[PDB]
Design a protein around this nucleic acid. Structure first.
Lengths: 191, 203, 194, 173, 141, 107
RNA sequence: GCCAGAACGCGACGAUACUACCCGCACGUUGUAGACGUAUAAGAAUAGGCUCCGGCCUCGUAUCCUAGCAGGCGAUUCCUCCGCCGGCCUCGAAGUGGCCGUCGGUAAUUCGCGUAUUGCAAUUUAGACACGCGCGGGAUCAAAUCCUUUGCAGACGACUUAG
RNA sequence: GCAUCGGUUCUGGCGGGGGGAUAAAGGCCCAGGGAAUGUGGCUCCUCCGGGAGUGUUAUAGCCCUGGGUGUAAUACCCUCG
């Protein structure tokens, strides 16, 4: 059973510009520019109306049609990020040993670096470097918050997961030792 | 069918096993073949599948003495293609041995074999055989993870010869532009009746 | 791989190096570099300066040819030793300019190495003629009451492997092998005039 | 194979006790009339107490499509044998004649269910007169209003004897 | 919100689209059976272009730029001919590049040996004036 | 003047003998003619004459070049290969050599 | 990193007596997995490209070259095309191509003499790579082994040295 | 080597005859009856391409039954050259 025609549409607001060439998407707006390569998927792009983007697949299988919705939301995320940005929050959870962090500034390049000390009273100083385009800040609204912001969801989210995965307890009951750093909220910079 | 003195095949975009079958038939007939850019060939299926196939090959070795008789595992992209062809030829006879001298394989484009016309075999091209949506790999990448050492040297040299050809294109474009204007200017002025006589003949 | 395309020599060569190119020097005519020397002082050495320009253009690494003065040692031998030393430096133009300026000049070891530095030593070990398995590999000796010798290996293989394998200890030549020993330290560099 | 529809009429051999026996008629799909008669005795042996030795064939004819240039939808009722047990299905096809649907059905069942010709019985074939009696979802899409679609990525045809082309082909026919 | 997309665009398989069969024949689509087969016919006075009514597989056909407007689905042969002549399909196809290329070929397979010699001498006579103009332009540069 | 060539024959190649899978028969050979693809086109060359010329070492009657004569018998397969029969079977070392196909018995 | 180095895998340099070396052409005993127009350089995508910016693309079924005693001798005509040398630039992945100049040849048009007899077919003995020779010009005046000796080496050869 | 014949065999082209529902379809013509993936009209919405409803040939056309043109043509099978 092969489906003859499957189609989706993406609206575009009257603030930014988008250009597609050889299945290479470039999105540019007020807050910057991003690029993504989709040469691995057979899709036909078209301009339905003055502010609507259309894409479709012909004679596709059940497995092939599945990827059609995946592509649509990825491009929409790019439009949101260039006009509204992203913002993640994290909290510290400790029982006895306080957790100290030091978000030092740019290390002669655009990357930020975060230093974590005194995790469950260990003498390791453990260092993680963020992806370019991501800025890390220490919150002043209230205690024990890390705020990450940027333009692309893929870079912001992956860097946030890097911090969470590095603080792990070994050879202990993890239902009792809940020490670590965890993500607690996801949202945009504007509104 | 046509008989040429020598034919040069550009290897980029050709399936490994389908191209080797065409070549082995031509050699036994009497043709001469030269394969260029053996590092740009293709194999169907994901890369991980090819790696497992190669690792099983490396485990075979003569037990009592590894310096004799054992399967010698060549690691270059041109040598991988050569191994495929040797299995399709009776290489243990005088007739088969003579056929292998009519084949040459290289990485990149050596100086003798640039400034030449490179043909294409359409029965082994990937874009005409594989179904869209499937996965494939590159022979050049596979050689990197088994011990090939001169991958980056070839990449640099290939960038040089491609820059030289860009300047040659400008000269070729100018020559065609000048020839078109000459034909338009001459044909109108002089020939009174040779034109339509040629046109009725199909020229 | 890598390959060499040019090489240039100095105008005058000592009798120490010239001995290296001959196997019977005493009854020879000693015409080693006679015709090459005329390349100097001929068109103001036009041929020589062309090759130096080539290396500045096509090469990526540069090495230097040097030899020892064995005549200043109590050794009986008079034939010198020759080798190549690689120059690691700022630029290819800098490498050739520095190398060319050192023709027929002496260099002391204090300019190359300095105190308390960790270096490596490469040489050929002491030789022994032809030895058995007990000393060559270090296997256990057989009991005192063994017939037909007791300094051997009792079993050298199974049956259907069917050949003596490459991993079994056997008698042969020991010593005089090439070896590379690393991580040695320098305590002091002493001057000869002192 | 290449089939065509027949009608075949049989009869029990008349006897002194029962002159003028009854007459039976069937529709049989077969490559030729030699095997058309053979299938008639096979189906009849499962319904009445008549054999070939004690019967006879009255007439055999050929039925041809009335309008072989009109497109129409078909529905088939059938039974078959699996590797364990017997089952019933009902499938649909879209084409121009009655004969080809049986040809299409035989190839379809041989691929999807590994069912041979030996173990398939055809119960009834009927042409769907209306458009609201189409059940399966792979045929409603073929009867949608204003159907049209392109044909992307179609390989050009090249002679199998012309090796060593001189330029790269294109797939935008 | 300027949007520029550089993507391919094929020709649709609709009703009224005329195909070109392998042996130089034209047929107009009147019914779609599957995604692989269609029902088509072409009524043409010229015996070289005419084709009967029947089913043609789509893998042996080429899509020409001509399309007949407002062709009713499943029309009979009489109604198709009425639209075929009204739109002037025969005249429209004669001036296409595909037709001209085929015609330019046909004159070449029918050439007498004496005629091959004649065209060689005429080409050389025209070639002489090309080199004179080429040298003049090249010298001017 | 007169820069043209001098050729009045069609060139072919000697492929192999006539064989099954393990037995060969040197009586007849297989020859691939240049430019012929289908068996319909191969019907034109039935009955023509072919020659095989090679170099010897000794001179006998004013030359060092010998010839073996033959003719085309019937088509072979669907690929335009043809069969031929010579007065002497070909030297069996010429698997890949070239032969000349004449046009003597015309029309 | 480290150990061996294909004894039929490769590169740079030194000195080369004995024609062993280089240049010119002169023939030909002799060799060849097989000339007979052995004619064609962009890169990249294939659910997209090329361009002389007007347009063009299923198709190499294309382009260039192609007449004359195996291709003669003259004329009317025409400034086209081809070749051997020489001088400047350039080319290193296994080093190639360009420009200029001298000289020799030349149906784009149209003509005048010669072809026979190989007898009604019999390869159309014609190409380029090596190698052996014969001339006449240039340059050149070397090494290795045995032997005595050494012990950083050693069953014997071999190896490190000296004469 | 060529021309005229004999035996065996492979492979092309052309002219006829018969059968079936005396093929079935199909073109043109006559008579009757229907419907929608509803042509033209009419209504409404959308100007942003167009969409929705009503309703049986008009400014498109389709399906079913019977007759003439018919001993129509063509496909398949067999057969004389």
């Amino acid at each position: 059973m092969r489906y003859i025609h499957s189609e989706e549409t993406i609206p575009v607001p009257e603030n930014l510009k988008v250009s597609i060439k050889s299945r290479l998407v470039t999105v540019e707006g007020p807050r910057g520019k991003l690029q993504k390569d989709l040469s691995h998927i057979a899709v036909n792009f078209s301009v339905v109306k003055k502010g609507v983007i259309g894409l479709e697949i012909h004679h596709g299988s059940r497995k092939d049609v599945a990827a059609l919705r995946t592509v649509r939301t990825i491009i929409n995320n790019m439009i949101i990020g260039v006009t509204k940005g992203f913002k993640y929050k994290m909290r510290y959870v400790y029982a006895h040993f306080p957790i100290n962090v030091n978000v030092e500034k740019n290390a002669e390049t655009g990357c930020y670096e975060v230093e974590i000390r005194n995790f469950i009273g260990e003498k390791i100083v453990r260092k993680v470097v963020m992806a370019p385009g991501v800025e890390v800040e220490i919150s002043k609204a209230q205690k024990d918050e890390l705020i990450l912001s940027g333009n692309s969801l893929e870079a912001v989210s992956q860097s946030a997961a890097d911090i969470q995965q590095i603080c792990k307890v070994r050879n202990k009951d993890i239902r009792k030792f809940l020490d670590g750093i965890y993500v607690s909220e996801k949202g945009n910079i504007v509104e | 069918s046509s008989f040429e003195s020598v034919v040069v095949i550009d290897g980029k975009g050709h399936l490994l096993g389908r191209l080797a079958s065409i070549v082995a038939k031509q050699l036994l007939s009497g043709q001469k073949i030269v394969v260029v850019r053996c590092e740009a060939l293709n194999i169907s299926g994901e890369f991980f599948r090819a790696k497992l196939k190669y690792h099983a090959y490396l485990r075979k070795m003569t037990r009592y003495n590894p310096t004799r008789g054992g399967p010698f595992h060549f690691r270059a992209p041109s040598r991988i293609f050569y191994k495929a062809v040797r299995g399709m030829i009776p290489h243990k006879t005088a007739r088969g041995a003579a056929a292998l001298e009519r084949l040459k394989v290289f990485e990149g484009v050596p100086p003798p074999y640039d400034k030449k016309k490179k043909m294409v075999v359409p029965q082994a091209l990937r874009v005409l055989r594989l179904q869209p949506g499937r996965k494939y790999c590159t022979v050049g990448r596979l050689s990197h993870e088994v011990g090939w050492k001169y991958q980056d040297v070839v990449a640099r040299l290939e960038e040089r010869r491609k820059a030289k050809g860009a300047a040659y294109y400008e000269r070729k474009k100018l020559a065609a532009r000048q020839l078109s204007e000459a034909k338009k200017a001459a044909a109108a002025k002089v020939d009174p009746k040779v034109s339509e006589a040629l046109a009725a003949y199909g020229y | 791989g890598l390959r060499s395309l040019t090489t240039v020599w100095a105008e005058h060569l000592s009798d120490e190096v010239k001995r290296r190119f001959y196997k019977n020097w005493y009854k020879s005519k000693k015409k080693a570099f006679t015709k090459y020397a005329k390349k100097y002082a001929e068109n103001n050495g036009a041929s020589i300066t062309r090759e130096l320009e080539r290396i500045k253009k096509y090469c990526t690494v540069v090495r230097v040819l040097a030899h020892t003065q064995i005549r200043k040692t109590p050794l009986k031998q008079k034939k010198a030793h020759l080798m190549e030393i690689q120059i690691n430096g700022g630029s290819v133009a800098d490498k050739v300019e520095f190398g060319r300026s050192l023709f027929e000049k002496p260099v002391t070891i204090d300019t190359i190495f300095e105190k308390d530095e960790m270096i490596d030593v490469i040489a050929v070990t002491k030789g022994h003629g032809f030895v058995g398995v007990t000393a060559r590999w270090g296997t256990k000796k057989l009991p005192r009451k063994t017939h037909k010798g007791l300094r051997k290996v009792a079993c050298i293989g199974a049956w259907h492997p069917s050949h003596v394998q490459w991993t079994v200890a056997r008698a042969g030549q020991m010593g005089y092998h090439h070896r590379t020993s690393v991580n040695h330290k320098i305590y002091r560099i002493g001057k000869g005039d002192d | 194979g290449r089939l065509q529809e027949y009608q075949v009429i049989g009869r029990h051999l008349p006897t002194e006790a029962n002159p003028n026996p009854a007459l039976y008629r069937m529709r049989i799909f077969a490559p030729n009339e030699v095997v058309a008669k053979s299938r008639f005795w096979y189906f009849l042996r499962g319904l009445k107490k008549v054999k070939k030795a004690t019967g006879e064939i009255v007439s055999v004819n050929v039925i041809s499509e009335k309008h072989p240039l009109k497109v129409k939808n078909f529905g088939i009722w059938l039974r078959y044998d699996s590797r364990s047990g017997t089952h019933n299905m009902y499938k649909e096809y879209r084409e121009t004649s009655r004969v080809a649907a049986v040809e299409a059905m035989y190839a379809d069942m041989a691929a999807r269910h590994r069912a041979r010709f030996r173990s398939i019985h055809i119960l009834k074939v009927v042409e769907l007169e209306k458009t609201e009696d189409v059940k399966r979802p792979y045929i409603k899409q073929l009867v949608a209003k204003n159907l049209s679609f392109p044909l992307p990525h179609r390989v050009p045809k090249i002679s199998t004897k012309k090796i060593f082309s001189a330029k790269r082909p294109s797939t935008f026919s | 919100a300027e949007i520029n997309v550089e993507a391919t665009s094929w020709r649709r398989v609709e009703v009224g689209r005329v195909l070109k069969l392998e042996n130089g024949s034209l047929a107009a689509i009147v019914e779609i059976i599957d995604h692989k087969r269609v029902l088509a016919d072409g009524p043409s006075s010229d015996p070289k272009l005419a084709t009967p009514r029947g089913i043609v597989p789509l893998s042996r056909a080429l899509l020409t730029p001509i399309v007949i407007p407002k062709l009713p689905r499943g029309a009979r042969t009489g109604a198709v001919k009425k639209a075929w002549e009204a739109y002037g399909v025969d005249a429209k196809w004669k001036e296409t590049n595909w037709a001209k290329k085929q015609l330019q070929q046909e004159r070449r397979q029918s050439l007498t040996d004496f005629d091959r010699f004649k065209v060689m001498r005429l080409k050389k006579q025209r070639r002489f004036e090309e080199r004179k103009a080429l040298a003049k332009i090249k010298a001017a540069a | 003047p007169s820069e043209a060539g001098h050729r009045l024959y069609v060139k072919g190649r000697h492929l192999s003998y006539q064989r099954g899978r393990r037995n060969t028969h040197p009586k007849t050979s297989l020859i691939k003619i240049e430019g012929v693809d289908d068996t319909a086109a191969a019907n034109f060359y039935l009955g023509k004459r072919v020659a095989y010329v090679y170099r010897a070492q000794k001179e006998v009657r004013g030359t060092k070049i010998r010839v073996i004569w033959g003719k085309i018998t019937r088509p072979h397969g669907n690929s335009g290969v043809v069969r031929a029969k010579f007065t002497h079977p070909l030297p069996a070392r010429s698997f890949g050599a070239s032969v000349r196909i004449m046009l003597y018995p015309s029309s």
